[PDB]
Amino acid sequence: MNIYRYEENPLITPLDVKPIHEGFEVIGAFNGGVAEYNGEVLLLLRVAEKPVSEDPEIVLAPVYNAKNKELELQSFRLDDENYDFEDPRMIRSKAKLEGFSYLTSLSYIRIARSKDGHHFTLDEKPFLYPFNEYQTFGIEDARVTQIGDTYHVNFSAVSEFGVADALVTTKDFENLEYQGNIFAPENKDVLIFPEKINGKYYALHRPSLKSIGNLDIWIASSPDLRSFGDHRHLLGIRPGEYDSGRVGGGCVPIKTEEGWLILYHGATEENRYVMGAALLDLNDPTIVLKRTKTPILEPVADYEKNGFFGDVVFACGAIQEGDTLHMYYGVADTSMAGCDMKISEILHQLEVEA
Ligand X SMILES: OC[C@H]1O[C@H](O)[C@@H](O)[C@@H](O)[C@@H]1O
Residues lying near its own copies in the complex (CB under 8 A) are found at: 96, 98-101, 133-134, 158-164, 179-187, 205, 207-213, 216, 218, 220-224, 226-233
Distance, in Å, from the CA atom of 330 to the CA atom of 352, rounded to the nearest integer, reads 28
Is 333 marked within a binding site?
A: yes
Distance, in Å, from the CA atom of 19 to the CA atom of 15, rounded to the nearest integer, reads 10
Cβ neighbours around 105 below 10 Å, total: 23
- Is 45 one of the binding residues for ligand X (CB under 6 A)? no
Is 178 marked within a binding site?
A: no
- Is 164 one of the binding residues for ligand X (CB under 6 A)? no
Residue placing its CB nearer to ligand X in the complex, 158 or 343: 158
Count of residues making up the chain: 354
With CB under 5 to 8 Å by kind, the binding choice for 331 among its own copies, ligand X, none is: none
Is 293 marked within a binding site?
A: no
Whether residue 338 contacts residue 6, with contact meaning beta carbons closer than 8 Å, is answered with yes
With CB under 5 to 8 Å by kind, the binding choice for 187 among ligand X, its own copies, none is: its own copies
Short-list 148, 188, 141, 177, CA closest to 43: 141
Phi-psi map region of 242: left, alpha, beta (phi>0 left; psi -120 to 50 alpha): alpha
Enumerate residues 78-97 that contact ligand X by CB under 6 A.
89-90
Residue placing its CB nearer to ligand X in the complex, 27 or 343: 27
Residue placing its CB nearer to its own copies in the complex, 184 or 300: 184
Enumerate residues 262-321 that contact ligand X by CB under 6 A.
none
- Is 153 one of the binding residues for ligand X (CB under 6 A)? no
Cβ neighbours around 194 below 10 Å, total: 19
**One-letter amino acid identity for 185?**
P
CB burial of 8-43 (b: ≥16 within 10 Å; e: otherwise) equals: ebbbbbbebbebeeeebebbbbbbbbbbbbeebbbb
CB of 283 to ligand X, least distance (A): 33
With CB under 5 to 8 Å by kind, the binding choice for 140 among its own copies, ligand X, none is: ligand X
| Strand, coil or helix: 261 | strand
- Is 140 one of the binding residues for ligand X (CB under 6 A)? yes
Annotation: binding site: 31, 46, 89, 140-141, 188, 273, 333
Contacts with ligand X by CB under 6 A lie at 89-90, 103, 140, 156, 158, 163
